[PDB]
Amino acid sequence: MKATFQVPSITCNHCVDKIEKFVGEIEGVSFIDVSVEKKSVVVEFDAPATQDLIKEALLDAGQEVV
Secondary structure: OEEEEOOOOOOOOHHHHHHHHHHOOOOOEEEEEEEOOOOEEEEEEOOOOOHHHHHHHHHHHOOOOO
């Protein structure tokens, strides 16, 4: 139960705080991992979540991920 994405619009802390505030708890988030120098993002989600939940939240939060 883990996910691995990448936010091409990284390179900042304000974005991490915004995505962490939303992703910090998406009714099924184990741990939101982010990589600025690598421009990657690894998030763990439990059974009450889905990569469509972290996207709907992270995307609606103001972040982009392909």
